[PDB]
Design an enzyme around this catalytic site. Structure first.
Site, short mmCIF file in Angstrom:
data_model
loop_
_atom_site.label_atom_id
_atom_site.label_comp_id
_atom_site.label_asym_id
_atom_site.label_seq_id
_atom_site.Cartn_x
_atom_site.Cartn_y
_atom_site.Cartn_z
N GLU A 271 -5.74 -3.78 -6.55
CA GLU A 271 -5.98 -4.36 -5.24
C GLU A 271 -7.00 -5.49 -5.34
O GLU A 271 -7.99 -5.34 -6.09
CB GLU A 271 -6.56 -3.31 -4.29
CG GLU A 271 -5.64 -2.12 -4.02
CD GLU A 271 -4.45 -2.50 -3.19
OE1 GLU A 271 -3.63 -1.52 -2.96
OE2 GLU A 271 -4.28 -3.64 -2.76
N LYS B 221 0.00 3.50 -2.89
CA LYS B 221 -1.15 4.40 -2.89
C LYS B 221 -0.70 5.85 -3.00
O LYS B 221 -1.44 6.69 -3.51
CB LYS B 221 -2.04 4.15 -1.67
CG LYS B 221 -2.72 2.79 -1.71
CD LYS B 221 -3.45 2.38 -0.45
CE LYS B 221 -4.22 1.08 -0.61
NZ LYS B 221 -4.23 0.22 0.60
N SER C 191 -5.98 3.60 4.19
CA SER C 191 -5.46 2.47 3.46
C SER C 191 -6.59 1.62 2.82
O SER C 191 -6.47 0.39 2.68
CB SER C 191 -4.50 1.62 4.30
OG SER C 191 -3.45 1.16 3.45
N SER D 101 0.80 -1.22 0.00
CA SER D 101 0.00 0.00 0.00
C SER D 101 0.83 1.27 0.00
O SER D 101 0.25 2.36 -0.16
CB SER D 101 -1.00 0.03 1.15
OG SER D 101 -2.01 -0.92 1.00
N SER E 45 1.46 -3.42 3.84
CA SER E 45 1.76 -4.76 4.27
C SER E 45 1.15 -5.76 3.27
O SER E 45 0.22 -5.45 2.53
CB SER E 45 1.28 -5.06 5.70
OG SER E 45 -0.13 -5.03 5.80
O1 LIG Z 1 -4.66 -6.40 0.84
C1 LIG Z 1 -3.86 -6.88 1.66
N1 LIG Z 1 -3.43 -6.21 2.74
C2 LIG Z 1 -3.76 -4.88 3.09
C3 LIG Z 1 -4.98 -4.30 2.75
C4 LIG Z 1 -5.23 -2.97 3.09
C5 LIG Z 1 -4.30 -2.24 3.80
C6 LIG Z 1 -3.11 -2.83 4.17
C7 LIG Z 1 -2.11 -2.01 4.93
N2 LIG Z 1 -2.07 -0.67 4.92
N3 LIG Z 1 -1.02 -0.34 5.71
N4 LIG Z 1 -0.44 -1.45 6.15
N5 LIG Z 1 -1.12 -2.53 5.67
C8 LIG Z 1 -2.82 -4.12 3.84
C9 LIG Z 1 -3.34 -8.27 1.49
C10 LIG Z 1 -3.66 -8.93 0.29
C11 LIG Z 1 -3.21 -10.23 0.03
C12 LIG Z 1 -3.45 -10.81 -1.32
F1 LIG Z 1 -3.47 -12.13 -1.30
F2 LIG Z 1 -2.49 -10.47 -2.22
F3 LIG Z 1 -4.57 -10.39 -1.87
C13 LIG Z 1 -2.41 -10.92 0.94
C14 LIG Z 1 -2.14 -10.26 2.15
N6 LIG Z 1 -1.42 -10.67 3.23
C15 LIG Z 1 -1.41 -9.65 4.10
N7 LIG Z 1 -2.07 -8.59 3.66
C16 LIG Z 1 -2.56 -8.96 2.42
O1 LIG Z 2 -5.80 -4.40 6.99
C1 LIG Z 2 -4.67 -4.90 7.07
N1 LIG Z 2 -4.39 -6.09 6.47
C2 LIG Z 2 -5.24 -6.89 5.69
C3 LIG Z 2 -6.38 -6.41 5.06
C4 LIG Z 2 -7.12 -7.28 4.23
C5 LIG Z 2 -6.74 -8.60 4.08
C6 LIG Z 2 -5.56 -9.08 4.67
C7 LIG Z 2 -5.09 -10.42 4.42
N2 LIG Z 2 -5.40 -11.15 3.32
N3 LIG Z 2 -4.74 -12.33 3.47
N4 LIG Z 2 -4.14 -12.32 4.66
N5 LIG Z 2 -4.29 -11.12 5.23
C8 LIG Z 2 -4.84 -8.22 5.49
C9 LIG Z 2 -3.58 -4.23 7.83
C10 LIG Z 2 -2.44 -4.86 8.32
C11 LIG Z 2 -1.44 -4.19 9.05
C12 LIG Z 2 -0.25 -4.94 9.52
F1 LIG Z 2 -0.14 -4.98 10.85
F2 LIG Z 2 0.89 -4.31 9.10
F3 LIG Z 2 -0.12 -6.09 9.07
C13 LIG Z 2 -1.57 -2.86 9.44
C14 LIG Z 2 -2.70 -2.24 8.95
N6 LIG Z 2 -3.06 -0.93 9.17
C15 LIG Z 2 -4.21 -0.78 8.53
N7 LIG Z 2 -4.69 -1.97 7.91
C16 LIG Z 2 -3.70 -2.86 8.18
#
Ligand SMILES: O=C(Nc1cccc(-c2nn[nH]n2)c1)c1cc(C(F)(F)F)cc2[nH]cnc12
Ligand SMILES: O=C(Nc1cccc(-c2nn[nH]n2)c1)c1cc(C(F)(F)F)cc2[nH]cnc12
Length: 263
Positions: free
Chosen positions: A141, A48, A105, A45, A212
């Site tokens: 995304e 973004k 995010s 992200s 992440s």
């Molecule tokens: O979309 C994802 N993560 C996400 C979404 C929104 C915001 C943030 C974030 N913003 N600031 N830090 N983390 C992170 C995500 C997607 C996928 C996949 F498979 F590619 F679709 C695997 C993941 N494993 C951990 N996170 C993910």
């Molecule tokens: O939303 C988040 N992650 C997310 C969203 C959607 C899907 C998945 C996911 N998909 N498959 N595994 N995990 C993970 C997120 C994670 C993190 C962290 F801690 F860095 F991992 C910080 C964040 N601050 C705001 N949003 C986040």
């Protein structure tokens, strides 16, 4: 050469088990501090910022673009939609989508920015227009966060991202009011207190964008206004060998503390 700062970042990295990338630009002097600065990392992200900035650039020639409504349909929701889901069957403006993407995010909001730009390649094209030959956005995304080791898609290098972030937030890649808007948005981020900012003195002001993904990928990019110093730009990227790895925002904080302690 290897500096004392680089040697501490390597020790942090070794203890973490992962792969750490750092780039500092000190605008006190334009000097740079790099660790794996030319290696590629999945942006997640942190990308973004480039998307929102590309829309801000479009807005320089369309005074009403940021007020333009964009339909959010049920099918547009993806995996992390805290703002957009409240507007399903309604609209959000491009300003609202930019704010949601950057400060919350929101992944649906990011996809609307990407679509406004004609797809991932429109984000890359903007990067190229502002002198960044390294950035690439290949997917939407949520799949841009797969973060697979060795995969070039949706990557950049720390060096390139720090340079670009400087140009966008402190330099002239954007017009004056657009730069100010980007800075305001970054300063109002909700997600950053555990990442770079946690490693810095509390009196310093930070604007940042986190990210992440899989492989425990944990990222932050920041523009920093230290107490008594010219601004800094700092990129910290971190990724791990195991698909299921836990996020490690503390490693980013630790990297930032080493950087601060080295100034
Ligand atoms: O979309 C994802 N993560 C996400 C979404 C929104 C915001 C943030 C974030 N913003 N600031 N830090 N983390 C992170 C995500 C997607 C996928 C996949 F498979 F590619 F679709 C695997 C993941 N494993 C951990 N996170 C993910
Ligand atoms: O939303 C988040 N992650 C997310 C969203 C959607 C899907 C998945 C996911 N998909 N498959 N595994 N995990 C993970 C997120 C994670 C993190 C962290 F801690 F860095 F991992 C910080 C964040 N601050 C705001 N949003 C986040």
């Amino acid at each position: 050469q290897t500096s004392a700062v680089q040697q501490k970042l390597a020790a942090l990295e070794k203890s973490s088990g992962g792969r750490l990338g750092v780039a500092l630009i000190d605008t006190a002097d334009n000097t740079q501090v790099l660790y794996r600065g030319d290696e590629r990392f999945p942006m997640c992200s942190t990308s973004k910022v480039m998307a929102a900035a590309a829309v801000l650039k479009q807005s320089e020639t369309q005074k009403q673009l940021l007020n333009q409504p964009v339909e959010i349909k049920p099918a547009d929701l993806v995996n992390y939609n805290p703002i957009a889901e409240k507007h399903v069957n309604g609209t959000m403006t491009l300003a609202e989508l930019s704010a949601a993407a950057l400060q919350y995010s929101d992944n649906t909001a990011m996809n609307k920015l990407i679509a406004q730009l004609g797809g991932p390649g429109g984000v890359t094209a903007f990067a190229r227009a502002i002198g960044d030959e390294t950035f690439r956005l290949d997917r939407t995304e949520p799949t841009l966060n797969t973060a697979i080791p060795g995969d070039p898609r949706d990557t950049t290098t720390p060096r390139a991202m720090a340079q670009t972030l400087r140009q966008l937030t402190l330099g002239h890649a954007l017009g004056e009011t657009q730069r100010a808007q980007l800075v305001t948005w970054l300063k109002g981020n909700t997600t950053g207190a555990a990442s770079i900012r946690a490693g810095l003195p509390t009196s310093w002001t930070v604007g940042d964008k986190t990210g992440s993904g899989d492989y425990g990928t944990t990222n932050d990019i920041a523009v920093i206004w230290p107490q008594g110093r010219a601004p800094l730009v700092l990129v910290t990227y971190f990724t791990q060998p195991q698909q299921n790895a836990e996020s490690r925002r503390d490693v980013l904080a630790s990297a930032a503390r080493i950087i601060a302690e080295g100034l």
